[PDB]
């Protein structure tokens with residue numbers, strides 16, 4: 437699992453421990469061990485959501501499996517909740533794209549997971 | 551619809567109104583009201599295109615529907631035109647990836663669109 | 665072909681000719697002319713991999729074709745090797761996502777490649 441957050445909120449507004457919390461919460465949500473999880477947080481971005489520059493985020497979650505209708509609703513509740521509580525971004529100014537990756541299309545450690 | 555532009559043009563060369571211009575023009579092109587459209591512009595990037603560091607852009611357009619052969623050819627004209635006029639990028643140094651998203655794979659407001 | 669590498673290693677630790685090397689090596693690996701290859705390197709990122717902020721990278725390679733099981737294993741050896749030699753990133757702290765794009769979904773110069 438790989439989670440990327442792009443946001444216009446300033447870097448100073450990202451709390452200490454945020455990347456750790458994301459790693460832990462995504463491990464619980466996906467069932468995968470934390471060693472597998474990558475997080476990437478990108479603050480201070482030039483963004484608009486609905487033509488407004490108020491706090492917003494564009495995110496993506498890539499995973500080898502564990503992607504689907506019900507799971508994605510659960511991930512959205514979790515991840516919008518964290519962006520609201522920790523970065524003060526309204527959930528209706530967040531988009532999250534979910535991508536189910538084939539293992540043969542994910543490289544790691546000089547090879548692929550195929 | 552979500553439109554992302556990655557470019558090596560400096561931040562100071564991105565007009566203040568560019569995000570709003572892109573929002574409005576994408577609303578007209580996709581038929582979706584502007585409240586649904588998100589835009590992200592990423593300047594000052596370390597990039598090469600054809601082995602040259604002259605101005606260039608790598609872009610993505612994600613949308614639930616409104617993606618297809620003919621539509622994508624039309625979007626390329628709209629977006630090349632905007633990047634040429636406002637960021638002074640040659641249109642042969644622009645790539646745009648088009649992604650047709652399933653509503654079940656787009657999170658928003660604690661849920662998904664499915 | 666389009667290759668993007670996001671990393672937490674500092675900008676100052678990216679060698680001068682790194683973009684050029686990636687372009688030439690991707691041309692040899694993919695068989696496509698360098699004039700069609702785009703490269704994008706993003707240092708200084710806020711990232712965690714397995715819960716650790718030691719040097720890591722999240723990358724993607726997009727191509728119209730030339731993506732597949734054994735091919736992706738070969739790309740991973742090539743690219744992990746370059747990230748290890750030049751950026752000092754351990755290969756077990758690199759993920760690379762491989763994307764086989766339909767030509768109708770790749771825009772360039774006021775049209776698509778279809």
Ligand SMILES: *C(=S)NCCc1ccc(S(N)(=O)=O)cc1
Nearest residue numbers: 437438472473498499500542549
């Ligand atoms: C998230 S994209 N992690 C990539 C690493 C990885 C390795 C194995 C598996 S498994 N055995 O299919 O659960 C998932 C993810």
Ligand SMILES: *C(=S)NCCc1ccc(S(N)(=O)=O)cc1
Nearest residue numbers: 551552582586587612613614656
């Ligand atoms: C772009 S990715 N917008 C996502 C939000 C969205 C997309 C489509 C529609 S609709 N009801 O099909 O017009 C609404 C909202």
Ligand SMILES: *C(=S)NCCc1ccc(S(N)(=O)=O)cc1
Nearest residue numbers: 665666696697700726727728777
């Ligand atoms: C990478 S995504 N390049 C853009 C698409 C593409 C693919 C192949 C060729 S060629 N000249 O036939 O090798 C050009 C452009």
